[PDB]
Amino acid sequence: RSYPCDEKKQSVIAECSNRRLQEVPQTVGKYVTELDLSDNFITHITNESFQGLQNLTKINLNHNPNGLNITDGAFLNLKNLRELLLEDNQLPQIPSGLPESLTELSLIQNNIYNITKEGISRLINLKNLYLAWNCYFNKVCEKTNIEDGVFETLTNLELLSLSFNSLSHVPPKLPSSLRKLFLSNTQIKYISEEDFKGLINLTLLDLSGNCPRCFNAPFPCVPCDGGASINIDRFAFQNLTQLRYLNLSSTSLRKINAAWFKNMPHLKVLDLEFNYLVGEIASGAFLTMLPRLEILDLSFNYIKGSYPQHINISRNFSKLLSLRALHLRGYVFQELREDDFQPLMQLPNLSTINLGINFIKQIDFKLFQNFSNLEIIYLSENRISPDFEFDPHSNFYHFTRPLIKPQCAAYGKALDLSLNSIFFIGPNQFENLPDIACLNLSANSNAQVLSGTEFSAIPHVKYLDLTNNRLDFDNASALTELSDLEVLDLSYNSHYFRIAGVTHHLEFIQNFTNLKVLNLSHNNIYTLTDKYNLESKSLVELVFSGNRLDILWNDDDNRYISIFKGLKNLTRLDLSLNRLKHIPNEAFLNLPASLTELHINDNMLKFFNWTLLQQFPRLELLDLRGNKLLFLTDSLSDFTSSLRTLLLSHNRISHLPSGFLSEVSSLKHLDLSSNLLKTINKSALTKLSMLELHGNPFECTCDIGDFRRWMDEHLNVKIPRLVDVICARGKSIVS
Amino acid sequence: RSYPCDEKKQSVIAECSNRRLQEVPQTVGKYVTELDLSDNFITHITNESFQGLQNLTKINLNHNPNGLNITDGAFLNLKNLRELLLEDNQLPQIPSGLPESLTELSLIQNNIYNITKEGISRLINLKNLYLAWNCYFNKVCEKTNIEDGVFETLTNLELLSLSFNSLSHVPPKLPSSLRKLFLSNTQIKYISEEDFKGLINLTLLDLSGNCPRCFNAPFPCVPCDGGASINIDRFAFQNLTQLRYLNLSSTSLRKINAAWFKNMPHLKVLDLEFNYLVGEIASGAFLTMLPRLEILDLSFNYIKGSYPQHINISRNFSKLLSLRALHLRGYVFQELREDDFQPLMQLPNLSTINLGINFIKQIDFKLFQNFSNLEIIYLSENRISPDFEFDPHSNFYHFTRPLIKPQCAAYGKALDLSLNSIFFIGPNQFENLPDIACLNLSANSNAQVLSGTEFSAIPHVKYLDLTNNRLDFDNASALTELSDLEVLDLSYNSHYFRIAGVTHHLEFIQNFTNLKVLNLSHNNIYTLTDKYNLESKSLVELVFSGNRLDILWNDDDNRYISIFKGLKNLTRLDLSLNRLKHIPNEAFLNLPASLTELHINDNMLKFFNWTLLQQFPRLELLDLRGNKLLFLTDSLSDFTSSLRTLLLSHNRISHLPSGFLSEVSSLKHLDLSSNLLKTINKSALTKLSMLELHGNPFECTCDIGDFRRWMDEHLNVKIPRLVDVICARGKSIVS
Ligand SMILES: *[C@@H]1O[C@H](CO)[C@@H](O[C@@H]2O[C@H](CO)[C@@H](O[C@@H]3O[C@H](CO[C@H]4O[C@H](CO)[C@@H](O)[C@H](O)[C@@H]4O)[C@@H](O)[C@H](O[C@H]4O[C@H](CO)[C@@H](O)[C@H](O)[C@@H]4O)[C@@H]3O)[C@H](O)[C@H]2NC(C)=O)[C@H](O)[C@H]1NC(C)=O
Ligand SMILES: *[C@@H]1O[C@H](CO)[C@@H](O[C@@H]2O[C@H](CO)[C@@H](O[C@@H]3O[C@H](CO[C@H]4O[C@H](CO)[C@@H](O)[C@H](O)[C@@H]4O)[C@@H](O)[C@H](O[C@H]4O[C@H](CO)[C@@H](O)[C@H](O)[C@@H]4O)[C@@H]3O)[C@H](O)[C@H]2NC(C)=O)[C@H](O)[C@H]1NC(C)=O
Ligand SMILES: *[C@@H]1O[C@H](CO)[C@@H](O[C@@H]2O[C@H](CO)[C@@H](O[C@@H]3O[C@H](CO)[C@@H](O)[C@H](O)[C@@H]3O)[C@H](O)[C@H]2NC(C)=O)[C@H](O)[C@H]1NC(C)=O
Ligand SMILES: *[C@@H]1O[C@H](CO)[C@@H](O[C@@H]2O[C@H](CO)[C@@H](O[C@@H]3O[C@H](CO)[C@@H](O)[C@H](O)[C@@H]3O)[C@H](O)[C@H]2NC(C)=O)[C@H](O)[C@H]1NC(C)=O
Ligand SMILES: *[C@@H]1O[C@H](CO)[C@@H](O[C@@H]2O[C@H](CO)[C@@H](O)[C@H](O)[C@H]2NC(C)=O)[C@H](O)[C@H]1NC(C)=O
Ligand SMILES: *[C@@H]1O[C@H](CO)[C@@H](O[C@@H]2O[C@H](CO)[C@@H](O)[C@H](O)[C@H]2NC(C)=O)[C@H](O)[C@H]1NC(C)=O
Ligand SMILES: CCCCCc1cc2c(Cc3cccc(CN)c3)cccc2nc1N
Ligand SMILES: CCCCCc1cc2c(Cc3cccc(CN)c3)cccc2nc1N
Ligand SMILES: *[C@@H]1O[C@H](CO)[C@@H](O)[C@H](O)[C@H]1NC(C)=O
Ligand SMILES: *[C@@H]1O[C@H](CO)[C@@H](O)[C@H](O)[C@H]1NC(C)=O
Ligand SMILES: *[C@@H]1O[C@H](CO)[C@@H](O)[C@H](O)[C@H]1NC(C)=O
Ligand SMILES: *[C@@H]1O[C@H](CO)[C@@H](O)[C@H](O)[C@H]1NC(C)=O
Ligand SMILES: *[C@@H]1O[C@H](CO)[C@@H](O)[C@H](O)[C@H]1NC(C)=O
Ligand SMILES: *[C@@H]1O[C@H](CO)[C@@H](O)[C@H](O)[C@H]1NC(C)=O
Ligand SMILES: *[C@@H]1O[C@H](CO)[C@@H](O)[C@H](O)[C@H]1NC(C)=O
Ligand SMILES: *[C@@H]1O[C@H](CO)[C@@H](O)[C@H](O)[C@H]1NC(C)=O
Ligand SMILES: *[C@@H]1O[C@H](CO)[C@@H](O)[C@H](O)[C@H]1NC(C)=O
Ligand SMILES: *[C@@H]1O[C@H](CO)[C@@H](O)[C@H](O)[C@H]1NC(C)=O
Ligand SMILES: *[C@@H]1O[C@H](CO)[C@@H](O)[C@H](O)[C@H]1NC(C)=O
Ligand SMILES: *[C@@H]1O[C@H](CO)[C@@H](O)[C@H](O)[C@H]1NC(C)=O
């Protein structure tokens, strides 16, 4: 048992993050290799901080403290130190006399404005150097002075990142080992012919945000004089036969010179977001130069004040033969006509069209059929009708998450129409579409009574998202045309559920032979009409959080006592956030005997009838976190032989009953963190692999001794975050 | 300083609620008259519980414990006990040998099924007897046995309530002192001629929920055989000349006998909700019998399965000359035509029409003009387009809150169109309406760009509610036609605010010469377009909670540093729930010097620059509750002479600086509850009238003595909830 860090073996990692450590710990294990020490209160670092920690081949001192004084060659005597990370430390300078064994260095988010030979040129083994985000936006900081030639000694340098600094030009004397060159938001107007001419290995070049398009910028944005475009010499990308990824986002471009790509036969990803390329899109020769392009991002190229009827796509798109994804958000146009996308329809691997945020009013949906294999049709957010703000380690111009949830997209062809205005699905709404498997109609202000016919044209939908609408559930055949339905997400439709005098019919649930997952969360359900029960022979997982079981299962009311019992296959049930003070025993007994996993967290339970766990012989996880439980049973082993994980954090448990750890033979994980345990008696003292105790007011006196021994006896019981397992006054119990 | 209760003088009241008291306190003040002891853990009551507490003319033992054993005549020796309340106690019986001085008795929500002479007939001074809600719904309980004549001795009985018990008929031998008779939900099929014949003083009769209409009931509901109507003898309400309030809600009525009202010339409020009176509404003679009726509730009289084109209102409504409010929710019809309301238009005092929840599709709005003086036009929730569930002390069939917010209605003529489907305000949307002053368009899925013309037909709107829509704020003249605008509520319009690449224009705020109150809460505002500042010469109050000032006022960004300074008249600002870790001093200094009241609660502030309170010389209230403040300044008196209230609960303050209580000469209220104060030194020890300290881990040892003296010295400093001012282990500090 280590302290204050928590170790593992991936290759031996001392996770020592966030522990409020005030200086590097003396007490680290001697087989430790990677020591993560971020987010601590470390203020000073000397040579004698890592005195005897050898074969540390990684250090992380990010965010210290939560500015860091590092003496010169304080790391020098670590002859194995390879990866060093000292991001976000208000470092004034690249620290002096670093150990030349370093292969990866990260100085992101400091105050370093001077890149000197005295810090960098000795370090011949740098592969990846991260200096981004040191002088940017309206930060008080100085122009970035780069001593001449200071990189040419770094002949094993593969990745260099200087983004979000004021450079003004591409440094000269760049080693030709570079494969990845990041110069975004560096205030560079002009790209000369000599600028990259000897970088024959570059796979990636990022010149984004130089001469930026600043209208409506969510950050302080300085245009180039006259909102002028970036100036790229005609032979600037000569000799760059190995480029794969080119990012020219936000460089105010209006013209693309087709000859820029003459010597890039492999170009794979092109990013031209936030430029002014509406003209280039309609008639663009540069598109005939890219037969291996896979991803083209042309988002936010809208003309301010301009709302064209149709989008205008050059015939030249037809030539983009390897194109996989095409992103055209923020073009802004009223209508998508069948003719408008002819140039894309013969492209064989075009699987993703992104038309998000174009305020489109009508789509002639039949057009998506005439394509080859579209997989993701992304139309969200249109107008179709019946420390620190910016993360230095992600992409700055867009979100990188997938457009459509993987779990939904994995079923097949996907149509995301979320955040539109289809407030009512008419009879011909889905005429002429391909066989959609994944459908998002979230947030379309839909208030209709679904009745069994609305989806007849796409009857093979397998995952359906109708979250965040206002469905009026007043017809028992709703959605039953979707015989293949497997996932149905009905969250955040509380509008009509909340009104007691409108009708609520959920009977339809039973008709689905293949329904696996049903989410009814945040619907404020407390009254149903005519039928009180949920029935399905298939359903595996019901999410019923953010409803009102406190009302449903009121003591004076019997109507909903078997609400969930007809769910004969159910293995996971989420009853969290139901305002439950107590569950009547009979209603608890009528939960499906099939359950393996039951969540009743974040209610207000004062009591739990443990005895009833006898009728749930398959149950593996019981989650009661965030209630008001006062007492644990003394006889748990008598009610279950199945429970593997029991979660009880954020309750009011002050005493552990006899044999509680030893006697339950299937139980491996027990979470008692953040309760009211003053102690743990020797009488409470085996099949347990993890026990959580942080957050408790452990009275530290001579009485607390017995348990310590037990910890020493059982190393096989991980006890996390021992630093937070604390005497009630501050020291850990392990002192 | 009392303990454990907290006293006052209204006439001397010992508020002793909710204190976890385990028995009646010995230590009550001897001038105490009313002793509220509800919501405690009281289990037993004997004669020797109130030994020497005389001139107690009120006791409240509701919800004890949080069932109560009361010995016989345990209250007998209180010769002044007047009002006794023992609701919600699982009492098995009316307690025996109660003191005959009682004028008001409340036994609501117990288990009393036997109403005996041994408990009630002696008590000749009962005015008001509450026995409601003892056997109801699916509770395990017995039919209510009422010993014969047991009320006729109570000749000073004015109010009797037996609702929500199984009676089966109106008890006989009811004293003719009764003015108010509550028999709701008592399972009484038949009302005989003899039933009330000698009750010549009744002002109110409630026979609601006997033979109930049970379709879609939000409670276990037992129809009378055949869903039959209640049977009311033709001369059942003979001799009841003094009736004012008649409640016949949910008695399955289909016919009203006009002659029931022959001898009620004063009838004021008639409640016929949840019956089947569509026929009676269209052709109803009973309406010619009620020329003093003021309030008529005909809600939820819908025919299941039926959706008429027009509502059908008998000509006889024209005869309801004193009618003030008419409620017609849940009739359910498609269209309101001008002709359909002719019978109401000459009624002089008709100020309120309620058409909520009728799924109406079109209204011919010009019709509201032809009325006399309509004040509240309530149309919410239609389809217009471009312990314990039930509170025993409120009305069971409807919510009693006002239809329209008083603050909005106080400006004049009100139109509530909330929860409809006016997703777009067209040019003629508001043609032909009266001069609306108060307008609710909440929750209409409105996504348009308001532009300055939409309200031109009702330009004198003074309070405007557009909450819970999705407004696209992309035009600087939005709402500017409303030159008289005084209150503008823009909460919960985050849809477009949250998207960084759409435009956000709030410039319009400045054009309003009369804008007092602006709510921008829960809009997730973090980026504006072109103009970064909020400007108004009039605005008094800005609510900016649930936005992202953490982003706006990011350290690397200057654009929003004066966001609020142009609000030159501002006296109240709410910056709560902005995720603020810290406020740059310059942005804090640019808050309006006019401010008297500033809320920054529920953020995550680690530090507060108190020194800056020097530039806010009018500031009376500073609310920093629910942050992470570690330290208080030692020199507050140097930065302010205006602060009257300072609220610091839920922070991490462990020490009180010298002179903190004494030195600030304007400060009257200081809230330090729920921090981390182990003590309060004698050096921290005048103009203070209230100091809050409950929730702190006060170390109770010899050191804690000094402060106790100070408390004894200053009785003029209310310290609430001393019971919760607790040694860190359980006893109060005042022990
Ligand atoms: C202009 O356009 C270019 C070209 O697309 C963008 O280039 C990408 O830049 C992003 C952001 O810097 C890079 O993203 C990060 O890559 C790191 C390295 O990942 C590679 O190697 C690791 C193995 O070490 C693999 O696991 C991984 O699959 C990759 O093959 C990652 O470490 C980062 O992820 C980590 O941090 C993020 C922080 O958000 C966490 O969310 C993750 O969980 C993880 O811990 C991150 O993914 C990206 O690699 C660049 N692309 C290429 C091909 O090199 C530019 O950023 C863009 N410019 C601007 C300013 O927007
Ligand atoms: C059938 O229809 C009838 C006729 O309308 C309804 O009759 C009303 O019933 C309600 C609920 O019982 C009564 O409401 C309660 O009245 C109490 C007495 O208030 C009068 O006197 C006090 C002075 O003591 C005045 O302050 C007050 O203005 C009244 O003149 C109040 O004490 C109750 O309010 C208190 O408790 C509620 C609990 O919700 C709190 O919210 C309040 O803050 C307050 O503490 C309450 O208002 C009402 O008075 C009856 N009307 C008349 C004219 O007598 C029936 O209820 C209805 N039947 C059913 C089953 O719905
Ligand atoms: C409605 O509830 C459903 C069902 O629970 C929610 O979908 C599920 O969400 C969880 C995460 O919350 C997904 O599990 C996760 O999977 C990822 C990827 O494998 C993994 O990395 C995580 O550790 C976790 O296991 C789960 O796959 C997903 N299930 C389905 C069928 O999509 C849904 O999010 C809820 N809807 C709303 C609006 O809250
Ligand atoms: C948007 O913010 C406004 C302005 O603050 C909110 O309206 C105000 O709400 C408060 C209560 O939250 C009202 O004060 C209260 O008045 C009543 C009656 O006098 C009193 O009993 C209370 O003690 C309290 O003082 C205030 O009058 C009201 N102001 C106006 C102009 O209506 C509004 O509720 C917010 N909107 C949303 C949707 O949250
Ligand atoms: C349906 O569309 C909605 C809206 O685009 C998606 O909701 C987003 O999902 C992510 C991941 O949880 C959240 O972080 C965002 O907050 C959500 N956006 C909004 C506006 O709520 C949803 O995931 C889509 N559904 C599917 C199946 O892919
Ligand atoms: C505008 O209409 C909405 C919806 O009817 C009103 O919102 C309700 O107000 C009450 C009082 O705060 C809340 O308890 C309800 O939760 C609200 N309902 C909903 C659906 O949110 C609103 O008050 C009306 N505005 C005015 C000025 O009267
Ligand atoms: C992609 C972001 C475009 C931002 C501007 C913006 C454009 C909008 C449009 C398109 C449009 C662009 C330019 C001019 C016009 C005509 N006013 C419309 C339609 C509907 C709502 C519109 N709302 C907005 N906020
Ligand atoms: C006042 C509550 C009425 C409850 C029934 C109910 C009625 C609705 C109506 C009216 C209606 C009533 C009776 C029959 C019909 C025709 N299906 C419509 C229109 C639109 C949505 C409707 N949604 C509902 N849930
Ligand atoms: C760049 O390419 C051109 C022709 O493609 C060639 O003449 C020149 O030698 C190359 N430059 C370098 C430095 O390789
Ligand atoms: C499309 O991708 C497939 C593999 O998914 C590949 O075999 C094929 O060569 C690609 N076609 C083109 C024209 O790039
Ligand atoms: C559902 O709606 C369909 C289509 O109008 C209708 O025929 C059917 O009657 C409805 N079902 C029920 C159970 O009301
Ligand atoms: C749904 O299931 C019920 C009962 O199993 C059946 O009566 C009903 O007709 C079904 N509806 C459809 C459309 O399959
Ligand atoms: C029960 O669930 C399993 C696992 O999802 C599934 O294979 C089976 O079909 C379901 N049973 C029924 C009767 O639908
Ligand atoms: C648990 O519920 C059962 C009935 O299912 C009851 O007999 C038993 O007394 C309850 N146990 C506790 C501790 O409440
Ligand atoms: C009731 O009224 C009728 C006539 O209105 C009268 O004859 C009778 O005496 C009255 N009954 C009582 C008991 O007052
Ligand atoms: C209407 O109410 C007013 C007082 O607001 C009263 O003077 C008048 O008599 C009432 N009219 C009728 C017909 O009741
Ligand atoms: C607001 O909309 C009006 C009406 O179309 C238009 O004339 C005006 O140009 C718009 N204002 C701005 C500032 O765009
Ligand atoms: C609003 O105010 C601004 C500046 O005070 C002015 O230029 C603009 O024309 C105003 N618009 C209207 C409709 O009053
Ligand atoms: C400032 O507020 C006060 C109080 O609401 C108001 O009387 C005055 O008109 C406002 N001042 C201006 C310049 O609008
Ligand atoms: C408060 O802000 C002022 C600048 O307005 C600065 O001079 C001072 O140092 C700050 N005080 C603290 C305690 O941060």
**What is the SS3 string spanning A197-219?**
CCCCCCCEEECCCCCCCCCCCCC
Q: Which residues contact B203 (CB under 8 A, 6 or more apart)?
A: B179, B180, B242, B243, B244, B245
> Given an 8 Å threshold on Cβ–Cβ distance, is B526 in contact with A447?
no
Closest to B321 measured CA to CA, from B267, B258, B241, B254: B267
H-helix or E-strand containing A409? helix A406-409
Q: Which of B216, B551, B557 sits opposite A138 (nearest CB)?
A: B557
Dmax over CA atoms of chain B, in Å, equals 84
Residue B19 burial (CB count, 10 A): 21
**Euclidean distance between CA atoms A555 and A578, whole angstroms:** 15
Question: This structure's resolution (angstroms)?
Answer: 2.2
Ligand 10 environment, Cβ below 6 A? A 321-322, 348-349
| Tokens, residue B329 | 């929710």
Q: How far is CA A414 from the centre of its chain?
A: 21
Number of residues that this document lists for chain A:
735
Q: Which residues pair with A416 in a beta bridge?
A: A378, A440
Q: Please, are residues B725 and B732 in contact by the beta-carbon 8 Å criterion?
A: yes
| Tokens, residue B184 | 């709701």
**Euclidean distance between CA atoms A87 and A93, whole angstroms:** 12
Domains belonging to chain B, first-starting first, are 1-735 (3.80.10.10)
Q: Does A500 touch chain B (CB under 8 A)?
A: yes
Chain A residue closest in CA terms to B382: A447
Q: Which residues pair with B159 in a beta bridge?
A: B128, B180
> Given an 8 Å threshold on Cβ–Cβ distance, is A389 in contact with B554?
yes
In the reported structure, the alpha carbon of residue A238 is separated from the centroid of ligand 9 by a whole-number distance in angstroms of: 7
User: Distances in Å between the alpha carbon of A470 and those of A307, A419, A423, A523, A547?
Assistant: 31, 13, 9, 10, 15
Q: B357: alpha, beta or left, given left = phi > 0 and alpha = psi -120 to 50?
A: left
Closest to B576 measured CA to CA, from B608, B551, B543, B554: B543
Half-sphere exposure of A713 (CA within 13 A, CB side): 10
Half-sphere exposure of A210 (CA within 13 A, CB side): 25
- Cα of A305 to nearest chain B Cα, Å: 11
Pairing verdict, β A44-45 and A597-599: unpaired
Q: Please, are residues A580 and A608 in contact by the beta-carbon 8 Å criterion?
A: no
User: Distances in Å between the alpha carbon of A30 and those of A602, B269, B288?
Assistant: 42, 85, 98
Query: From atom 20 of ligand 7, which residue's Cα is the shortest distance away?
Result: A359
Residue whose tokens read 């408390």: B711
Q: How far is CA A123 from the centre of its chain?
A: 35
Ligand nearest to the backbone CA of B407: 4
Atom number in ligand 12 closest to CA A508:
1
Residue A44 burial (CB count, 10 A): 14
Ligand nearest to the backbone CA of A346: 10
One-letter amino acid identity for A147? Answer: E
Experimental method: X-ray
Q: Please, are residues B123 and B103 in contact by the beta-carbon 8 Å criterion?
A: no
**Euclidean distance between CA atoms A91 and B590, whole angstroms:** 30
Q: Does B360 touch chain A (CB under 8 A)?
A: no
Closest to B250 measured CA to CA, from B139, B308, B163, B167: B163
In the reported structure, the alpha carbon of residue B621 is separated from the centroid of ligand 20 by a whole-number distance in angstroms of: 21
Q: Please, are residues B170 and B429 in contact by the beta-carbon 8 Å criterion?
A: no
The per-residue DSSP string of A125-153 comes to: T-SEEE--SSS-TT-S----EE-TTTTTT
DSSP B710: H
**Euclidean distance between CA atoms B537 and B552, whole angstroms:** 23
Closest to A408 measured CA to CA, from A400, A416, A420: A416
> Given an 8 Å threshold on Cβ–Cβ distance, is A139 in contact with B503?
no
Phi and psi at residue A400, to the nearest 5°: -100, -5
In the reported structure, the alpha carbon of residue B220 is separated from the centroid of ligand 2 by a whole-number distance in angstroms of: 24
Residue whose tokens read 């030893």: A662
Residue A70 burial (CB count, 10 A): 22
In the reported structure, the alpha carbon of residue A286 is separated from the centroid of ligand 10 by a whole-number distance in angstroms of: 21
In the reported structure, the alpha carbon of residue A479 is separated from the centroid of ligand 11 by a whole-number distance in angstroms of: 12
**Euclidean distance between CA atoms B734 and B727, whole angstroms:** 9
Ligand nearest to the backbone CA of B304: 8
Q: Give A554's contacts in chain B (Cβ within 8 Å).
A: 388-389
Any alpha helices (H) in A458-594, and if so which ranges?
A: 494-497, 549-552, 585-589
**Euclidean distance between CA atoms A23 and A32, whole angstroms:** 18
**CB < 8 Å & 24+ apart, contacts of B658-664:** B658/B634, B658/B683, B658/B684, B659/B683, B659/B684, B660/B632, B660/B634, B660/B636, B660/B684, B661/B685, B661/B686, B661/B688, B661/B691, B662/B686, B663/B636, B663/B637, B664/B636, B664/B637, B664/B640
* Best mutation site among A612, A632, A633, A638 for ligand 14 pocket (most ligand atoms within 8 Å of CB): A612
**Euclidean distance between CA atoms B326 and B312, whole angstroms:** 14
> Given an 8 Å threshold on Cβ–Cβ distance, is B218 in contact with A357?
no
Atom number in ligand 4 closest to CA B463:
31
Q: Which residues pair with A487 in a beta bridge?
A: A463, A517
> Given an 8 Å threshold on Cβ–Cβ distance, is B551 in contact with A389?
yes
- For ligand 9, is residue A242 a contact (CB within 6 Å)? no
Q: Give A389's contacts in chain B (Cβ within 8 Å).
A: 551, 554, 556-557
| Tokens, residue B111 | 């288990």
Residue B201 burial (CB count, 10 A): 15
Q: Please, are residues B611 and B636 in contact by the beta-carbon 8 Å criterion?
A: no
